[PDB]
C-alpha cells in the first residue's frame, strides 16, 4: 500500500535504455566460455591499425586494384606535385571506404593525430626523395613546392628502410571535429612534392609507384554514435 | 544488498543498483569495461621492434 | 653479432632458411597450443604423432605475370591429399591443428612488385549469381591455386564463385583485409612471408571435411615489372606446416 | 582514457623514428613528438563511447508482419533469423565471432481495414506472441491446441499500455554465435552452404486473441533486437557492397571507392 | 552440476564392469572409462533445467468458456478439474502422486457480435469470476442473490489493464493430489470408478457486472494454472496414446511405436 | 508520494514468470507431509533407468 | 543570505562616502547608513529565486509542428534549433557564452480531420519520434529503411499515457554554447556570417506507426527545453527589440522606453 | 510484487518540476570545462551595476 | 528484513528478495534446489553388487 | 548509498535523495548553490578604492 | 644495434632524414649559442621566436649537367624572402643567427662524381 506518483516519461519504449526485464528462460544452463584469439574490447583497436588508401580514385580506376598505386616517374624537372588530399577522413572519398572511415562514419565526433605510412614499391636500385607536408588552413591549398615547404613537413628519403611515417597532428580550434563536412572545422590539406627526383640505372624501369596506409594516434576518440550512410535496404531481404 | 557504483561525469556522484532477477541474465548491461589491449592487431610480430630502431639491421 | 634478416626454422624432419625475410608475425599474439583439459568436450582419447603430422609440406607453384590478379588457397583442403596429414584427417571425425604459413617469390634486384600474404578466417565467398550458391569443385581446389578474375564474373545463372579481384569474393574493399595477421613480399626488400595461424574456431574441435577455417589470400597489389633481358618467368611458392595437430573419433576411411 | 602528448625539443640524433619497414606486418606507432617539437597537452578526453558493448547496444528493428483480426492470415509466422535489417546486420558483421545475450520489445500497431459493415463497436484487441523452438509443433492454423502453450514461452498483451519485453540468455550449441561459416551441411561437401547451416533458432508466430469488431482490423508487429553483456572476437572488415540475400552473402561487384576529378583535387 | 570423466589408460584384468546380469534389476553404472580409453575432460555443464520445479513452473490454459452480455447464456460455470487439457495433463501424469501450490490467470476478451441494433455506445465492461467451494450454492440465474460473496472468494476486473491473478495452497483431504485410483466410491465396488471418485475440487463462475451497450456483446474467459513449491512421488511411463474423456483413462489401442523400411535401416 | 516510473514491459502477462501474488484463501491449514516412497527430484533420475527399445518395428 | 543594515549615529567628519568619481568605472556601494542614520534591522531574506539554475530551469515551448495518418505530409522535420521561440531565446540572450544539459518532453495531441468516410473506428495511434545528427540518414519518405534506427536514439509512445521526456548531456565541440559568433565560415570572411555558423545540432523527425483508422486525423507535436546544471558567463544586457529572424539578430530601431508628459510628470 | 496505490497528481507534466529522467545517449564523455573570466552565479550581480537612467523621455 | 542470495550465471552478482505477503503460500517459485538421489530408481537392489565383479558367483 | 539534504523552509525536515541511473548528466537539478562574488562586474578597478575616501586625490 | 648512415633531425616543426649520410661537421667544434650578458652591447630586449624563425626552409633545386661549374649562395639573402625569418630580419635592425646546411643530390650505382659543399666566411668577391 506504498502510495507513489507516476513522473512523465513513464511507459514509453526509449531506444537507448537500460533497464532489467524478466528473463522468457527460467534457469538456463549457458555453454560455457572459451579462449578464441583475437578478443576485441573497443574499437580504437581496428582504427590503429593500417588501412591501404585509395588515393588514385580517378574514374575507371576505382574499378581495379590501380586505385591504391600512386604513379612516380623520372621526371625533366623538379619540385613538382605527386598527390594531395583534405584532411577530411569521415567525408572526403579517399578517406569514406578506409577502416579508420568506416569505423568514423558510426560516430558523428572525432579527435586526436593521423599516422600516414608510405611505402615505396620500386626497384632496388631506384633512389628518390620526396616531401610530404601538411598544411592547416587559412589559405589555399599549396601550388608550388615554396608554398608547402613552409607547412609541416617531413623530407623522405627512398632507401634500405622502404617505409616513411607521417604524423599529421592535432591543430584545431575545437577539442572536437565533425565528421561530416563543415568549414568552421576545416582539417587541412596533406600534399607530396618532388624532392630532387627519382634516378634508375640502365635497363631498370623508370615507373614506379608509391602505396599509402592510414592509422590512427594513441590518443584517438570518437563520440556520438549516428547511423551510417552508407548500406541501405528498398525491403526486408529474403 | 545494494550495490553503490560511481557515475560517468565530466572532468576537470555515487548511484545504487540492485538486482531484482534471480537469473543472472536480466541484469542491466555492464557499460563501464573501459580496458583494452591493442597488442593483438598492431605490432603482433614475434620479435620486439623498438620505435628508434633500423627494422631491418 | 647477427642480423635478423636471416632466420632458420625446423619442424619435424624439415627446414626452412631464409637470408632475406622480415619479422615472423605469430597470428593475434597467440603460440598454437595443444587443447586443454579444463576446455574439452570429447571424452575419447586423442591421437598426437606431431612428427609426421607436423612438417613442411611443399604444394604447387604458380606463376607471377604481369597481368595475375592473385590467388587463394584453403589450408584444410590444400593438405588433405598429402602425406598423414592427409591420411589422419580422412580416418577420424574430429581435428585440430594450427598452421604455419611460409611464401618464397624471389626476383633480382631490377624487378619490381608487391604481394599481400593474408591468413582470413571463415572467408565465406558469394556465388556469381544471387540466387545460387557456390560449389565444392569450383570454391576449394585441392593442392591447386584458384586464380581471381580482374573484371566481374557473369550474372548468368552459375555455380561459379565471384572472383573479382576487388572485391576478395568476400564482397568487401581489398584495402581493409590487412585487420588479418598479412605480411608485404616487396620485391626491393622482402624475398618470403611467415606466418603462425594458431587454431580460430567457435568450438573445441570440428570436422576438417566439411570446413575449411583459414583461407590463405595472395594478392599482387602493385603488378610486377621489368625491362627486357630479365628472366620473365618468376614463381610463386608456399609451404604450410601444421603445428599442434590432434584428432578423435577414429571411423572408416571416408572420402 | 586517452594518452597525452609529451613535451619534446629540437634533436639532431642517428636514430630515426620516423623511418621503419612497412613489409613486416608492424603498425610503426610514431608519436606526434617523434617528427615535430610538441608542447605538454594533457587529455582529459575518453574512449568511453567506443566499448563494443556501447556500440552494440542500441534497440534495431529486424523484422515486421502482419496479420488481420478476420481474413486469410490469421497468424503470422517468422523464422527467428538475424541478416534480414541491413542496418544491424552490417553493425553484426564486423566481428566474426560474436557473443551476447539479447533483449526483445514487440511493438504491435493496430489499424481498421476499409470496409462496409455498420455498426462497429470497437474492443481492446489482446495479442498472443507465442516462440516454437526447433522441433516443437506448430499451429497450421489460428485456433488449435498448439496455443495452450504448456512449456513454450508465451506473452499476452492487450492495446494501450506499455509495449511487452523480455530477456534471452546466450542459446547456442556451440561457445559463440558464428556469424560466418565457410563449409557446408553434408560432410559430402554438397548441400546447404553458408551461414544458413547454423540457423536453427526456431520460430515466431503472434495471434489475436479476440476479435476485436465486426469489421476487419490489421495489426502489424515490429520485433527489435538489444544485445547485453557482449563479447567479440576476430575483427572483420566492413561490408562495403549492399546485401542482397538473407541466406548467404552473395552480392553484386561495386566500385571500391566514388571518384573525384583528378590526383591533386581537393573537392569531391 | 553434472560428473566429470576420470581419464583410463589400456588394462588387462580378470574382472570386466561390461558384463553383468540384467535379471537383477539393477541398472549397471558403466562410465565411457570401462569400455574405452578417455581422457580427463571436466563438465561445467548443470542440470538446473531438468529439475521438477523447472518442468512444471510454466503457465499452461486448462479451459475456456464463453458468456453473453445479453442473450440465453448470461453466466458461465466450470467444475475445476484438470485432465481438459492434454499438454497439462500429460505433463501431470508423469508422476502418480503430486502435491503443487497453484497461481491462476485469468485472460478475459470480449467481441461484439453482429447484430442490426443501430446508436451503440461501447462502456468499459467489468467481469466478476467467482469460486463455490463443493456445498455452497449455486447462482441459478445471473441476477441472484448468491453473486454477494459474503465467504466465497471473488474478483472484478475491468476492461483495459493487467489480466487478475491469484495464489492457491495446496486444497486436499489427504496429503497428496492423487493423479490415479484404482477403485470405486462405494466398497460395494459398483458405482463411479477411477479418479473421478477425488474430484471434488468446487465450481468457479462468472459473469458481466454491467450491461456494456445495446448491441450484443460476448466475452471469453481463459484459466491459466501454475504449479508452485511442486513435490513428486512415484514416477510413472509416459502417456502414448491420445486421450478421449476428461473423467478416465479409456483409450484407443495404438502401435509402440512409427515403423520403418527393415532392420538395418539407418533412415525413418 | 514516491515518484516512480513504468518502464516498457509493465502490465504484461509472462507465461514463464516468477513473482509475487496474493493468495485467495489466507491463513490456511496446509495437510501436514508424510514419508512417500519414491520421491523425485530431478527428472534425470528416470532417464537414468534402463528402458526396453523396439529394435525391431518393421511393418505389423 | 540578505546583508543586514548596521545601526549609525550623526557624524560629522571630512571624509564624505557619498561623494566619489563614476569615471572611475566603480560602482559606488554606500549602505543607507552612510546618507542618513539607520537602525539594526537584521534581514532573513534571501537571494534563493535569483540564481541562474532557478532563472533558466523551467520548461519553455521552442517549437512545434504537424502531421497527418493519411495525406500529402505524413512525416515532420524539424532542425534542432534555438531563437524560434521569443520567451525562452530572450532569457538565453543575457549571457554570451552558456552551458547546459537538457531535458527535453514532447506533448503530442491528435485531432480528426473533417472528412465523408463513414464507419470509423478509432485505433490507438502511436508515434515515433527519432532524432538524426548531423551526417546520418534523411528519412526522404514517411517509409524508409531510415526509420530502423539502428543506432540514432529514438522513442516510441501510444497514446492515453504520460508524455515522452528524455535527457540529453552537454553536445558541443567547443567548451561552451556559443550565443553570439561575429565572423564568417569561410576564412575569406565571405559566406554565412552569424550565429547561424555554429548551429549543427542535427535534425529530429516524428511519424505515425499505424495508420489509426479511415477518417483522416492530424497530430501535432510540442517540444519542450528544460536546462539543467547551468553555467553562464559574460553578463551581456536586454534585447529591448522584438526579433524578426531565427538564423540572425537582424531588427528594426525601436525607441528607448515609452515616453510621457513631462520632465516631471509622476504618471505613465 | 511490491503492493503500491498511485496517488492524485500522477501521470502529468508538470512545468516547474525537478524529476530524473533515462538519459538518450548514454556514457558520453563530455568536453572538459575551462576558465572563462566573469562566470556569473547569482542573478543580484547585474542589478548591482549602474545603468544609465533615461529620465528626459519627453516625447521625440 | 531481506534476504540476499547468487544468481544462476554461466560457468568459466548477488540479487535480493523480499517476502511482502504474510500467507507462505504466496513466496516466489522455489527454482535452486538441484539435489538428486538415483539411488532408488536405478541399483535398487538389497545387496550391494560392485562394478566390476560377477554379478552372479 | 542514500544522500540526505536539508529543506528549503523559510525563517524565524531533512530529505533524502538517491541516484538510479548512471549516466551522472540524469540527476536532479542542483538548486541549492547559493553563492555569489559581485567584485568581478562591480568595483573591477585595479587600485582598490576605500568608501569614504576622495576617489581622486 | 644501428648504424651510422641513417640520420634524422628535427627543428621546429620540420624533418629531415636521410638514409646514406655521413658524419655531421659542427662548425669550428662549437654548436651555435645565444648571446650570453657578458657579451652584449644593444641595451634593448631581444626578440626570439625559436620555432617560426628555426626551421628547414627548401630553396629552388639546380640541374647538375656534365658541364657544370659551380653554384653559390649567401645565407642572409636566400632566406629574406622566405617565411617569418624574412618578415623578421625585415622589420628589425640587428639580427643573429647560427645555420644547419643540408645538400640532397641522389644517384643510382651506376652515375658517379663528386661535390665539396663548403661554407665560406666572409667570402668578398
Ligand atoms: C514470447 C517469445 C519470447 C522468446 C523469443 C525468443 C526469440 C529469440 C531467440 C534467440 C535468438 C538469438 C539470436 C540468434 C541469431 C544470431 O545470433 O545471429
Ligand atoms: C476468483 C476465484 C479464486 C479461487 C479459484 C480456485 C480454483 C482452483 C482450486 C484448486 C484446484 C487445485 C487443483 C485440483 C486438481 C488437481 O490437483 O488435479
Ligand atoms: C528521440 C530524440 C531524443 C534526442 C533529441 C535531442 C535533440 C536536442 C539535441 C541537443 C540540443 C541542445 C541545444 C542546442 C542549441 C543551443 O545550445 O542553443
Redesign the interface.
Known sequence: GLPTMNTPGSCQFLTSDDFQSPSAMPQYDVTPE?????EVKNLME?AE??????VQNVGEKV???E???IPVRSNEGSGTQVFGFPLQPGYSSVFS???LG?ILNYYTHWSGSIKLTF????????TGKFLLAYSPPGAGAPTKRVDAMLGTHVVWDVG?Q?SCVLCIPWISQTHYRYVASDEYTAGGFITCWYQTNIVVPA???S???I?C?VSACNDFSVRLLKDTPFISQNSFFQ | GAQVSTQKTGAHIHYTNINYYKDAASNSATRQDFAQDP???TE????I?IKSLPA?? | GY???VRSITLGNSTITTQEC?????????WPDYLK??????????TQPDVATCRFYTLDSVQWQKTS?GWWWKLPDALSNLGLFGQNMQYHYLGRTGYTIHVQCNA???????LLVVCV???????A???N????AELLGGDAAKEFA?E?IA?GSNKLV?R????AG??????????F??????????NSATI?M?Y?????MD?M?????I?LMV?????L???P??TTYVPITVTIAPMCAEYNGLRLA?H | RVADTVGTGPTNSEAIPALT??????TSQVVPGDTMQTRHVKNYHSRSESTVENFLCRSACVYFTEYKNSGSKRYAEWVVTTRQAAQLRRKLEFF??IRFDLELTFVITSTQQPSTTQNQDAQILTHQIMYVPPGGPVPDKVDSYVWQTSTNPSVFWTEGNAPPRMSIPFLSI???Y??????????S??G????NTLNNMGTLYARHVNTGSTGPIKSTIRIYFKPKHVKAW????????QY??AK??????????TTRQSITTMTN
Open positions: 572459451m579462449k578464441i584469439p583475437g581496428i591499425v593500417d588501412s591501404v588508401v585509395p574499378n581495379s586494384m586505385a591504391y598505386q571506404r578506409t577502416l568506416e611505402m615505396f614499391c620500386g626497384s632496388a636500385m631506384a634500405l622502404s635497363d631498370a624501369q615507373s614506379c609507384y602505396m596506409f | 597488442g593483438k592487431f603482433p610480430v614475434k620479435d621492434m631491418l639491421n | 642480423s635478423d634478416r622480415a619479422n615472423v608475425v605469430v597470428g593475434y599474439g597467440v583439459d579444463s576446455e574439452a568436450t570429447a571424452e575419447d582419447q586423442p590478379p633480382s634486384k631490377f624487378h619490381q612488385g608487391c578466417p571463415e572467408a565465406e565467398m558469394g556465388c549469381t544471387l540466387d550458391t557456390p560449389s565444392s580482374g566481374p550474372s565471384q573479382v579481384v576487388y572485391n568476400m564482397g568487401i574493399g581489398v584495402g581493409n583485409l590487412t585487420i595477421p598479412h605480411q608485404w613480399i616487396n620485391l626491393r626488400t622482402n603462425v594458431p580460430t574456431n567457435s568450438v573445441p570436422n571435411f566439411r570446413h575449411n577455417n583461407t594478392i599482387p597489389f602493385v603488378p615489372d621489368y625491362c633481358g630479365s571416408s | 619497414a612497412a613489409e613486416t606486418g608492424h566474426t565471432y556451440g561457445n559463440a558464428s556469424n560466418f561459416y565457410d563449409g557446408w551441411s553434408e560432410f561437401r554438397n546447404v552452404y553458408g551461414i576476430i575483427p572483420r572488415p566492413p561490408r562495403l557492397c542482397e540475400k548467404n552473402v552473395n552480392f553484386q561487384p561495386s566500385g571500391v571507392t
